[PDB]
Design a binder for these strands. Structure first.
Ligand SMILES: Nc1nc2c(ncn2[C@H]2C[C@H](O)[C@@H](COP(=O)(O)NP(=O)(O)OP(=O)(O)O)O2)c(=O)[nH]1
Ligand SMILES: [Mg+2]
Ligand code: NA
Ligand code: NA
Ligand code: NA
Length: 314
DNA sequence: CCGACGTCGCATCAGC
DNA sequence: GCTGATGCGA
DNA sequence: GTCGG
């Protein structure tokens, strides 16, 4: 069904990027995902329509695609200069639907036009521009291992009591990642209580961290690069998490996004709620955080077969 | 018919 | 100067 | 755009 899901993803992008209709963006994604998992070749819109997330308007477009191998709206929007320029610019990290509109309105449409107009870009955007190609390359696990080796080593160096845990697709054992996600704790930061700055500073000292998109007391977002053809520049996030909310942190930032969604809806059916900090019991009556001393406890609570990070794709 | 559609930390903007 | 709203990327 | 109160 690849043709149909490429069509739907491309509509979703225009809804988000150009139309600024986030809810139609999500509805097309929701339908692209349920169509992706469906083990038959779709022969009719009405057959699609059986699936949850596929309604009458997507059914119509499936039929037009089946009968013609395209949609008239999509062909038109691609041949539209304004729209397709707005869509493209949002590929720069730090340029969203709003900024891209503003650039395009004032004649700024390509990376070329962005490279000529630095004065009109915020700091995040300049970094996104500067690393445009690099931020779209993937990261083989062998480099993620090398990035990790470095991260754990410098972290332990600053203070032996830190615990650093690489999460995201890495922890799930993916053969390649889009980026590095790192979680951080320390005995002297819990909910009852420079810890991130010091780590970031050390990783800048040894030339691992090359730029900074944003930085606060608990969330850093930035760029790194392995030491030396020189490696691509890579996205890295580091979050400082309360030691006593550690396991909820690791679950959430281990993901995937789609597994967390799943686990959060199941947590509804069994009368609990889960964010990155806590699991709390719910008549909608979300009370106090529960004790947690393993990822498993969180599965124990909502009665779910514990799952290996390995198996948290869906 | 019409409201819901996750939540979060940080940077930047609007407005007093 | 400050607070609160919004943009952005998860 | 899809769903469901
Ligand atoms: N609430 C929320 N959480 C998210 C979202 N996206 C991701 N997460 C959570 C779930 C993720 O597990 C975690 C890391 O975010 P990523 O680095 O963008 N995704 P990953 O590491 O899994 O894949 P790769 O890096 O290979 O692209 O953050 C989101 O949109 N919303
Ligand atoms: Mg990641
Ligand atoms: Na349906
Ligand atoms: Na962007
Ligand atoms: Na990430």
């Amino acid at each position: 069904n690849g043709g149909i899901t490429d069509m739907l993803t491309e509509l979703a992008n225009f809804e988000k990027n150009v139309s600024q209709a986030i809810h139609k963006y999500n509805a097309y994604r929701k339908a692209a995902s349920v169509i992706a998992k469906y083990p038959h070749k779709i022969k009719s819109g009405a057959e699609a329509k059986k699936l949850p997330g596929v309604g009458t308007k997507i059914a119509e477009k499936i039929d037009e695609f089946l009968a013609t191998g395209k949609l008239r709206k999509l062909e038109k929007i691609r041949q539209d200069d304004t729209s397709s320029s707005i869509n493209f610019l949002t590929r720069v990290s730090g340029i969203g639907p709003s900024a891209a509109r503003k650039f395009v309105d004032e004649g700024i449409k390509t990376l070329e036009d962005l490279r000529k107009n630095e004065d009109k870009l915020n700091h995040h955007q300049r970094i996104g521009l500067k690393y445009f190609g690099d931020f779209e390359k993937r990261i083989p696990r062998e480099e993620m291992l090398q990035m990790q080796d470095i991260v754990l080593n410098e972290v332990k160096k600053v203070d032996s009591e830190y615990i650093a845990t690489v999460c995201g697709s890495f922890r799930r054992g993916a053969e390649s990642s889009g980026d590095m996600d790192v979680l951080l704790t320390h005995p002297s930061f819990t909910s009852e209580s420079k810890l991130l700055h010091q780590v970031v500073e050390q990783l800048q000292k040894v030339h691992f961290i090359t730029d900074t998109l944003s930085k606060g007391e608990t969330k850093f977002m930035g760029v790194c690069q392995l030491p030396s053809k020189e490696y691509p520049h890579r996205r890295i996030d580091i979050r400082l998490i309360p030691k006593d909310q550690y396991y909820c942190g690791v679950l959430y930032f281990t993901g995937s996004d789609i597994f967390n969604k799943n686990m959060r809806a199941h947590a509804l059916e069994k009368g609990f709620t889960i964010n990155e900090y806590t699991i709390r019991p719910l008549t909608g009556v979300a009370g106090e955080p529960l004790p947690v001393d393993s990822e498993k406890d969180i599965f124990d609570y909502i009665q779910w077969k514990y799952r290996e990070p390995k198996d948290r794709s869906e």
